[PDB]
């Protein structure tokens, strides 16, 4: 069948030599069956039991019946004919049979035959795979179905490599068969040529039958003896040819050492470095097929090429993705920017480069891709997010992002996950970094290229740092905002925070500061500040905040602040404040001296009252006092008519004063958890009240008039 | 069960054991490829994928 | 169907059976003709 290619040239030649030997042996056997006889004539002068060999000539008359002739011929043929002369063709037939059995030994043995059939089928399909010739031509668009075909071919290749590369069974069996063939050829070529001479045309037999004949010695003729000599010479010449072929095979096999396929010339020529040398039971068959045809080796090599497998998988990845699925996958972030976050995706499908409307790209757990130039088609990309990817880039991609990138965000577990060409992007303005970048004796040195990022303005750090980086401090000359999230690690400013006078916002969350260094006050352009979870117990230093003339907002929430220093009354520039998650119990009147205050969040505190000076803070619009001890509401709370929304839920408030109707701008109110009994009717006359803006339990809400409920539901539906 | 981690394919009767032994003597891998459709967890995987 | 049911000993017994059939038929032929 298809097993033709398995047989080497010497295998076919042995096949045909055996064919010829069997043919001549069968002919000799069938001739000996019928026409083989011997013609015997006695000798009258018998001396020493031998033929003494002692007017027209007259015939010698032995006076013997033809039946007696037949009897003596048969007896002489049986007793005094060489056994080799009588069984040469049968012996040759047996030798041909055993040669054939040894040849088809590994072929008729199912154990190795299963491996052989699997190997030949896989080699056939890998030679004829449509993807193999494409990969060879690479030195593109593909069908999904052919992609599945080549993928299953790769899977079967891996399975077969696992199955047979270990074995080294067929090699041993073929070696044993070759040894048997060589030694058997030697044995027959020895003994047949030893015994060839015994076949002679004329024989002399003394069977000593005188009670039936009277004669002793007979001279007999075997007509085929010359013919059998010819057959013997021809057959042994065939045997010499077979033995020469077998010795060639065994010597070639011993010299070759084909238990590991060199496989380096093909991969070296085609630069397919992923063509490893295969072990025994795979190299031996590979060498045999190379003996048949070297090209078939390469036609399989490309399917042991990992680069080829990865390319095929990338083709399938491109086939799977449709621009519509990316279009539905495009989302809008909180920044109104079109986002296509690619997460745990093997590689880049270039179709994503057609949707120029992409504004923010976020990458997570994507294995080390390289940016192709087609990213130049993504005009709208301004912000970038890469999470744990040591990606590469191309020069046109780098040039496009050099002027078409505005913000960049990186989340890395290891330093190498930061590409080094980041410093070449000169239009970068906002940079976000997440992950421990801390190193020993080389800290803040890997990020030394930030000075090249001249247009850098915003900076977010989540790295658990304990020292302010030198390059960050140097580049802070043009930074307007800096964010550090040491998330537990205590940070020392080393006085190096004041050199960034151009800074306008500063956030240090969970930096465990425990105190305010003086350098913060040196930032004259600083306007807002958050120091969450810095474990701040005493904040009396706020008096130096008189230095900042543009001090707009401040956050010191999630701390130990239980008391309010009065010096904040100096800080009239404040417009917002958020000091929740603290243990504040009272509100000083001096706090109401910052009349510019507009937003407050004093939830989760020990506060139990509201001073009457709330009417002083007329600019206030939002206040949260959740999880406090509030049980009373001053009338002056309702003196601020521009109060928009309130978060007053979860307190001990017994009753809500009827002056809630004075809250004309009241949009959202939280009362859930309050110890209220009846909702004031004037709560239902607020123009901006809605059920969404009404966070209160249904049972307490039911005390409101039914018309109030109906108008609330109508405004909910409208 | 040890390799694929599928505790199914627990055992067989006399006839299935006889046939499986004969297959293994003929070829040790056809039995591995044949027992997959008897596996319960593999059947769950196929049902989940089809669904 | 006709090949996968045959272990190595089955193949060897089949070959021996074919050889024995040849032996018997050849012996019958020789008995008919030359015996």
From Swiss-Prot, chain A:
Q: Where are the LRR repeats?
A: 321-332, 333-355, 357-378, 379-402, 403-425, 428-452, 453-475, 477-499, 500-523, 524-547, 549-571, 572-594, 596-617, 618-640, 642-663, 664-686, 688-711
Question: Which processes are annotated in GO (biological process)?
Answer: aspartate transmembrane transport; cell volume homeostasis; chloride transmembrane transport; cyclic-GMP-AMP transmembrane import across plasma membrane; intracellular glucose homeostasis; monoatomic anion transmembrane transport; monoatomic anion transport; positive regulation of insulin secretion
Q: What membrane topology does this protein have?
A: Multi-pass membrane protein
Q: What is the effect of changing residue 33 to K/N?
A: Impairs activity in hypotonic solution
List the keywords (alphabetical). Acetylation, Cell membrane, Differentiation, Disulfide bond, Glycoprotein, Ion channel, Ion transport, Leucine-rich repeat, Lysosome, Membrane, Phosphoprotein, Repeat, Spermatogenesis, Transmembrane, Transmembrane helix, Transport
Which cysteine pairs are joined by S-S bonds?
40-220, 43-51, 76-205
Q: Which residues cross the membrane?
A: 9-33, 87-105, 175-196, 227-251
> Reported effect of changing residue 26 to D?
Abolishes activity in hypotonic solution
Reactions accelerated catalytically: chloride(in) = chloride(out); iodide(out) = iodide(in); taurine(out) = taurine(in); L-aspartate(out) = L-aspartate(in)
Top-level taxonomic group: Eukaryota
In the UniProt record, which residues carry a glycan?
52
The effect of disrupting this gene, in the record's words, is: Increased prenatal and postnatal mortality, growth retardation, and multiple tissue abnormalities. B-cell development is slightly impaired, without affecting B-cell function. Mice however show a cell-autonomous early block in thymocyte development and impairs peripheral T-cell expansion and function. Conditional deletion in germ cells leads to abnormal sperm and male infertility: the cytoplasm of late spermatids appears swollen, preventing reduction of the cytoplasm during further development into spermatozoa.
Q: Which Pfam families match?
A: LRR_14, LRR_8, Pannexin_like
Span of the annotated motif Di-leucine motif: 616-617
Tissue specificity is:
Ubiquitously expressed. High levels detected in the bone marrow; lower levels found in peripheral blood cells. Highly expressed in pancreatic beta cells.
GO molecular function annotations of the record: cyclic-GMP-AMP transmembrane transporter activity; identical protein binding; volume-sensitive anion channel activity
Q: What does this protein do?
A: Essential component of the volume-regulated anion channel (VRAC, also named VSOAC channel), an anion channel required to maintain a constant cell volume in response to extracellular or intracellular osmotic changes. The VRAC channel conducts iodide better than chloride and can also conduct organic osmolytes like taurine. Mediates efflux of amino acids, such as aspartate and glutamate, in response to osmotic stress.
Any domain commentary?
The volume-regulated anion channel (VRAC) channel forms a trimer of dimers, with symmetry mismatch between the pore-forming domain and the cytosolic LRR repeats, a topology similar to gap junction proteins.
The UniProt entry's sequence similarity note says: Belongs to the LRRC8 family.
- The protein in question is named Volume-regulated anion channel subunit LRRC8A
- Species of origin: Mus musculus
What gene is it encoded by? Answer: Lrrc8a
Swiss-Prot record, chain B:
Q: What happens when the gene is disrupted?
A: Mice do not show remarkable changes in body weight or the weight of white adipose tissue on a chow diet, but display significantly lower body weights and fat mass than wild-type mice when fed a high-fat diet. Moreover, improved insulin resistance induced by the high-fat diet is observed.
Q: Where in the cell is it found?
A: Cell membrane; Endoplasmic reticulum membrane
What is this protein's tissue specificity according to the annotation?
Answer: Expressed at very low levels in adipose tissue.
Induction info reads: Induced during the earliest stages of adipogenesis.
Question: The organism sits in which domain of life?
Answer: Eukaryota
Family label: Belongs to the LRRC8 family.
- Anything noted about its domains? The volume-regulated anion channel (VRAC) channel forms a trimer of dimers, with symmetry mismatch between the pore-forming domain and the cytosolic LRR repeats, a topology similar to gap junction proteins.
Q: What does this protein do?
A: Non-essential component of the volume-regulated anion channel (VRAC, also named VSOAC channel), an anion channel required to maintain a constant cell volume in response to extracellular or intracellular osmotic changes. The VRAC channel conducts iodide better than chloride and can also conduct organic osmolytes like taurine. Plays a redundant role in the efflux of amino acids, such as aspartate and glutamate, in response to osmotic stress.
- Assembly state and interactors? Heterohexamer; oligomerizes with other LRRC8 proteins (LRRC8A, LRRC8B, LRRC8D and/or LRRC8E) to form a heterohexamer. Homoheptamer; inactive, likely because it is not targeted to the plasma membrane in the absence of LRRC8A. In vivo, the subunit composition may depend primarily on expression levels, and heterooligomeric channels containing various proportions of the different LRRC8 proteins may coexist.
- Output this protein's name: Volume-regulated anion channel subunit LRRC8C
Q: Which residues of the full protein are shown?
A: 355 to 405 of 803
């Amino acid at each position: 069948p298809a097993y033709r290619i398995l047989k080497p040239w010497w295998d076919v030649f042995t096949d045909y030599i055996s064919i010829v030997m069997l043919m001549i042996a069968v002919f000799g056997g069938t001739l000996q069956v019928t026409q083989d006889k011997m013609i015997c004539l006695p000798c009258k002068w018998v001396t020493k039991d031998s033929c003494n060999d002692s007017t027209g000539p007259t015939g010698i008359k032995y006076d013997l019946d033809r039946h007696q002739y037949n009897y003596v011929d048969a007896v002489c043929y049986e007793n005094r004919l060489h056994w080799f002369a009588k069984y040469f063709p049968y012996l040759v037939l047996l030798h041909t049979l055993i040669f054939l059995a040894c040849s088809n030994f590994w072929f008729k043995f199912p154990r190795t035959s299963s491996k052989l059939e699997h190997f030949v089928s896989i080699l056939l399909k890998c030679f004829d795979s449509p993807w193999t010739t494409r990969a060879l031509s690479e030195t593109g668009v593909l069908d999904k179905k052919e992609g599945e075909q080549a993928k299953a071919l790769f899977e079967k290749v891996k399975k077969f490599r696992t199955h047979v590369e270990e074995g080294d069974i067929v090699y041993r069996l073929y070696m044993r068969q070759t040894i048997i063939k060589v030694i058997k050829f030697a044995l027959i070529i020895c003994y047949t040529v030893y015994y060839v001479h015994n076949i002679k045309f004329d024989v002399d037999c003394t069977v000593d039958i005188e009670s039936l004949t009277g004669y002793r010695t007979y001279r007999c003729a075997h007509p085929l003896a010359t013919l059998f000599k010819i057959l013997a010479s021809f057959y042994i010449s065939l045997v010499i040819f077979y033995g020469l072929i077998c010795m060639y095979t065994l010597w070639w096999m011993l010299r070759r050492s084909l238990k590991k396929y060199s496989f380096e010339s093909i991969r070296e020529e085609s630069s397919y470095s992923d063509i490893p040398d295969v072990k025994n039971d795979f190299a031996f068959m590979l060498h045999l097929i190379d003996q048949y045809d070297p090209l078939y080796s390469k036609r399989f090599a490309v399917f042991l090429s990992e680069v080829s497998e990865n390319k095929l998988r990338q083709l399938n990845l491109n086939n799977e993705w449709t621009l519509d699925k990316l279009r539905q996958r495009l989302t809008k972030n909180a920044q109104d920017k079109l986002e296509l976050h690619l997460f745990m995706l093997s590689g880049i499908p270039d179709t994503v480069f057609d949707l120029v409307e992409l504004e923010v790209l976020k990458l997570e757990l994507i294995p080390d891709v390289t940016i192709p130039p087609s990213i130049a088609q993504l005009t709208g990309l301004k912000e970038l997010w890469l999470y744990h990817t040591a990606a590469k880039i191309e020069a046109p991609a780098l040039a496009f992002l050099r002027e078409n990138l505005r913000a960049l965000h990186i989340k890395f577990t290891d330093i190498k996950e930061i590409p080094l060409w980041i410093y070449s992007l000169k239009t970068l303005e906002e940079l976000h970094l997440t992950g421990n970048l801390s190193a020993e004796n080389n800290r803040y040195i890997v990020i030394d290229g930030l000075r090249e990022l001249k247009r850098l303005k915003v900076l977010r750090l989540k790295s658990n740092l304990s020292k302010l980086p030198q390059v960050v401090t140097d580049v802070g000359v043009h930074l307007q905002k800096l964010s550090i999230n040491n998330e537990g690690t205590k940070l020392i400013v080393l006085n190096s925070l004041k050199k960034m006078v151009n800074l306008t916002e500063l956030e240090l969350i969970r930096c465990d500061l425990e105190r305010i260094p003086h350098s913060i006050f040196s930032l004259h352009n600083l306007q807002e500040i958050d120091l969450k979870d810095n474990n701040l117990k005493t904040i009396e230093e706020i008096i130096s905040f008189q230095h900042l003339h543009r001090l707009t907002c401040l956050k010191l929430w999630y701390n130990h602040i239980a008391y309010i220093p009065i010096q904040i009354g100096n800080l009239t520039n404040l417009e917002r404040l958020y000091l929740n998650r603290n243990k504040i119990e009272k509100i000083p009147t001096q706090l109401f001296y910052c009349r510019k205050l507009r937003y407050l969040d004093l939830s989760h505190n020990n506060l139990t009252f509201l001073p009457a000076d709330i009417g002083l803070l007329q600019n206030l619009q939002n206040l949260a006092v959740t999880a406090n001890r509030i049980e009373a509401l001053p009338p002056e709370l309702f003196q601020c008519r521009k109060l928009r929304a309130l978060h007053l839920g979860n307190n001990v408030l017994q009753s809500l004063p009827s002056r809630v109707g004075e809250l004309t701008n009241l949009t959202q109110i939280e009362l859930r958890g309050n110890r209220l009994e009846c909702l004031p009717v004037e709560l239902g006359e607020c123009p901006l009240l809605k059920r969404s803006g009404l966070v209160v339990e249904e049972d307490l809400f039911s005390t409101l008039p039914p018309e109030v409920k109906e108008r609330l539901w109508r405004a909910d539906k409208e | 069960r040890q390799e694929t981690g599928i505790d199914d394919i627990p055992d067989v009767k006399n006839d299935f054991a006889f046939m499986l032994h004969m297959i293994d003597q003929y070829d040790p891998l056809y039995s591995k490829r044949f027992a997959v459709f008897l596996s319960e967890v593999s059947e769950n995987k196929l049902k989940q994928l089809n669904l | 169907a006709f090949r996968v049911l045959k272990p190595w000993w089955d193949v060897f017994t089949d070959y021996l059976s074919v050889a024995m059939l040849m032996i018997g038929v050849f012996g019958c032929t020789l008995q008919v003709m030359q015996d």
